[PDB]
Amino acid sequence: SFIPCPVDTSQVILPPHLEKIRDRLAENIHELWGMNKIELGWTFGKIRDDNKRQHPCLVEFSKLPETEKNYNLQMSTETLKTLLALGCHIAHVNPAAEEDLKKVKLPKNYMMSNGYKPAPLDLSDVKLLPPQEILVDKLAENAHNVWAKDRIKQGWTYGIQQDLKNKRNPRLVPYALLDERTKKSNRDSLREAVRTFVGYGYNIEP
């Protein structure tokens, strides 16, 4: 009895100039995913093995399989279209920002056997304004409805234990019922996404 209804973006055109930031956002978001998984004990693997914690997507964003790469780009585009659908304006302010933009140097033990070492953008200094933090909460919750909707449209349903064969997932629940740990992790991701706009010189203002 779950009806995820994301913010309607069906009438939003993504201006051609925002396609770079769109690409930037997806890449940096992916790096965070890899760092988080490595920190959860995951390591590279040609094929996914939960018992061993091998993941084929622990590579650079480019080397990602097309099905997995395109998903990250579509979600990235929907994030920007969701901002636009919410009345926000996205315009480039500080062009030199991308110049003094440095990645995070993670310990050497973070490099996988596959040679991939995650290097997300160090955006710690980017302090978000109280209004921007509200936007993050919206994007976070709405990100969950977007994921859920797609998963439901592809034959997925709730289950107590995730089952790749049965297309069942315990997180297919309304945002309110979701575990706070996951909800917080998602907000953190969206928070970095909003920071990626600042760190790249763009201004996010309604």
Ligand X SMILES: O=C(C[C@H](NCCCO)C(=O)O)Nc1ccc2ccccc2c1
Q: Which residues here bind ligand X, judged by CB under 6 A?
A: 25-26, 29, 71-72, 75-76, 79, 143-144, 147, 171, 186, 193
Tell me if 30 contacts ligand ACP by CB under 6 A: yes
Closest CA to 185 of 32, 3, 26, 28: 32
- Judged by beta carbon distances under 5 to 8 A according to partner kind, the member of ligand X, ligand ACP, none in contact with residue 26 is ligand X
Single out the residue of 18, 24, 27, 72 in contact with ligand ACP (rule: CB under 6 A): 72
Write out the two tokens for 38. Answer: 């490595």
**44 neighbors 34 (Cβ within 8 angstroms):** no
CB of 152 to ligand ACP, least distance (A): 15
Nearer to ligand ACP, 9 or 79 (CB): 79
- Judged by beta carbon distances under 5 to 8 A according to partner kind, the member of ligand ACP, ligand X, none in contact with residue 144 is ligand X
- Judged by beta carbon distances under 5 to 8 A according to partner kind, the member of ligand X, ligand ACP, none in contact with residue 57 is ligand ACP
Residue 54 CB-density burial (10 A; 0-12 exposed, 13-18 middle, 19+ buried): middle
Tell me if 29 contacts ligand ACP by CB under 6 A: yes
CB of 147 to ligand X, least distance (A): 4
- Judged by beta carbon distances under 5 to 8 A according to partner kind, the member of ligand ACP, ligand X, none in contact with residue 68 is ligand ACP
**201 neighbors 92 (Cβ within 8 angstroms):** yes
Write out the two tokens for 181. Answer: 């740990």
Write out the two tokens for 28. Answer: 């940096």
User: 162-172: b or e for each residue (b if 16 or more CB lie within 10 Å)?
Assistant: eeeeeebbeeb
Distance CA 40, CA 53 (A): 9
Binding string, residues 45-64; x marks residues near ligand ACP by CB under 6 A: ------------x-------
Closest CA to 141 of 163, 116, 109, 173: 173
CB of 3 to ligand ACP, least distance (A): 21
Closest CA to 177 of 148, 155, 205: 148
Question: Which residues contact ligand ACP (rule: CB under 6 A)?
Answer: 29-30, 33, 57, 68, 72, 162, 189
